[PDB]
């Protein structure tokens, strides 16, 4: 049997799938650690791996990103879970080792990837208290090229009233994705700040895990793949539309929660934000 997780009700994606828009055709990188392309709950449609040491992209040893993928397009069936866009074409691009770290220009070398090779969503659950012009320069280049790029905001919670959103989810190009729970609330790792745009379910998310298992993560990288996740189901509604009306309809029709500085706009809500 399959269970959907809460998370893909609570941002009201069953009701898209009911309409027949799952996200067919739209392909979402995930630049992580790899994707387990046998798990039999993933189809994964091609990668490139960055990190020189481990050039199998479909191999992923740390599983971050397999449970980052199976937020984002976990397959309709009868095992598992089921994705947001459970029909999206899934690009494994490697750019973190098995102990989960990466250096930047791995990072900057997916993004290229990404965009040479006509991506239309960037999922980076990933993020650095450091930024560099250079990987400022990538992001913007996938954005004026028409990527939807999404990045979790960070898990380093509040310091007083010092914004703590770490790099890429700081530069206003990307859609930077704070964590809440089953009620809304704001989970207390969740980083805080004017450069935080949506929040997205962050605590406590099963998703599939490398060697054909299924686990329950927390962290802001889980509340990212709900809006990569989102951004392939709006577009699959209206392959006509630019990653400018996407960006702009998920965060117009948001469920605003508390404040700005701590929630951004709010809570996506995809059946409002899919028009
Ligand atoms: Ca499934
Ligand atoms: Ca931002």
Redesign the pocket.
Known sequence: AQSVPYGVSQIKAPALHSQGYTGSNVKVAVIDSGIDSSHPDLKVAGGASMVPSETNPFQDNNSHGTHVAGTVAALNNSIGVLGVAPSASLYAVKVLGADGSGQYSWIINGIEWAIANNMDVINMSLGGPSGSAALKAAVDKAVASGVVVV?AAGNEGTSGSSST?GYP????????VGAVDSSNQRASFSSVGP???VMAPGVSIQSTLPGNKYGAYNGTXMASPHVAGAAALILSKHPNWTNTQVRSSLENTTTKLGDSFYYGKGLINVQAAAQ
């Open positions: 990045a959103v989810g700081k530069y206003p190009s990307v859609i930077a450069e935080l745009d």
